[PDB]
Enzyme design. Structure first.
Site, short mmCIF file in Angstrom:
data_model
loop_
_atom_site.label_atom_id
_atom_site.label_comp_id
_atom_site.label_asym_id
_atom_site.label_seq_id
_atom_site.Cartn_x
_atom_site.Cartn_y
_atom_site.Cartn_z
N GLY A 114 0.95 -1.22 -0.19
CA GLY A 114 -0.07 -0.09 -0.15
C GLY A 114 0.76 1.26 -0.03
N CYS A 115 0.04 2.44 0.29
CA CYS A 115 0.90 3.65 0.22
C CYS A 115 2.07 3.25 1.29
CB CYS A 115 -0.07 4.83 0.68
SG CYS A 115 -0.28 5.10 2.37
N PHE A 116 3.21 3.84 0.75
CA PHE A 116 4.43 3.70 1.57
C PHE A 116 4.47 4.34 2.68
CE2 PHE A 116 6.16 7.59 -0.50
CZ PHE A 116 6.63 7.11 -1.70
N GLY B 44 2.19 4.94 4.79
CA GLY B 44 1.53 3.86 5.64
C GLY B 44 2.37 2.74 6.18
N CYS C 64 -3.84 8.58 1.09
CA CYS C 64 -3.82 7.81 2.35
C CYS C 64 -3.35 8.67 3.50
CB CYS C 64 -3.09 6.50 2.31
SG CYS C 64 -1.35 6.93 2.50
#
Lengths: 177, 173
Positions: free
Chosen positions: A27-29, A31, B28
């Site tokens: 996922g988004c890095f 994160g 995100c």
């Protein structure tokens, strides 16, 4: 000099005499980086976000090749923490199964483990199989030898093109504007 | 008691006598949190990640309503930093246009007052030419806010593994 310098973060703390690397896509890095730092900062040497792709057996990714994934590269001392512990943690911080694999199509967010050695590739494949009963639903995580890694900031500069504002790049970073 | 307590993060540092809130969607939320902490930590009071929607996809967002967005809620002292400065930073950390491109990662500003809603709409309009007049950012009154931990406990009660939830968090398994 083709000794694999293209595979290691330019900025990460790493000494090959005592440390190892593992590069993780889930996922988004930012994160991925948050999770490793929140839970394991005192047990790893360093970690750096960036983009990586693998030796594999459409849409450009923030101006670079279509197969690049958002990753965290982690440098660690195997006498402090094992690859097994780092990988067990990976399989608990995201949904690694087909219920979270990209089919609506942004492949840069895929679940993936990029191995820095032949021996590591084998251990990771074993750990994935051992997580399958707990996850139940088919694990989608790809396991590949690492082929390229760029620190995030470095990659944005390399693929700047004529796009300083990062149109069509979903990754957070402070644009030059 | 129907005074909007739900719209505030349960854990955020916030004093209504001197501080204000803005809730931001631009990808995100760990990304949004990282940006505000890296660049603006000394100028904000506090920030907390969560899920929000506003007074206005078929895919549910980690088990919840299809219109929830991943957000950072920021508490700030307007004498230390202005809403405009926070929003100027917002418009430089992501692509807020139609070229980018689930819907929980959409660009959005969730206002905590009618006055803020009007100011945010004016800032967006002022930013349009710099983004080629294609700014897609939704500006809406905030309708709900849940701390990321609290939302998961609420909409993933029967889904401890968080199947189909793209958000990073430590699953208990």
């Amino acid at each position: 000099h083709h000794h694999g310098s293209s595979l290691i973060s330019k900025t990460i703390k790493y000494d090959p005499a005592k440390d190892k690397l593992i590069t993780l896509a889930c996922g988004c890095f930012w994160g991925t980086e948050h999770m490793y730092r929140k839970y394991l900062n005192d047990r790893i040497v360093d970690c750096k976000v960036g983009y990586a792709n693998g030796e594999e057996s459409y849409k450009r990714v923030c101006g670079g090749d279509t197969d690049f994934a958002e990753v965290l590269q982690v440098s660690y001392n195997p006498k402090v923490i094992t690859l097994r512990e780092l990988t067990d943690f990976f399989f608990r911080i995201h949904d690694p199964t087909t219920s979270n694999s990209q089919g609506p199509k942004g492949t840069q967010y895929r679940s993936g483990l990029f191995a820095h050695s032949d021996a590591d590739l084998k251990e990771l494949a074993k750990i994935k199989e051992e997580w399958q009963p707990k996850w139940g639903n088919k694990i989608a995580t790809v396991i590949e030898p690492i082929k390229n890694f760029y620190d995030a900031e470095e990659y944005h500069q390399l693929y700047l093109d004529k796009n300083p504002q990062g149109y069509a790049c979903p990754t957070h970073y402070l644009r030059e504007m």
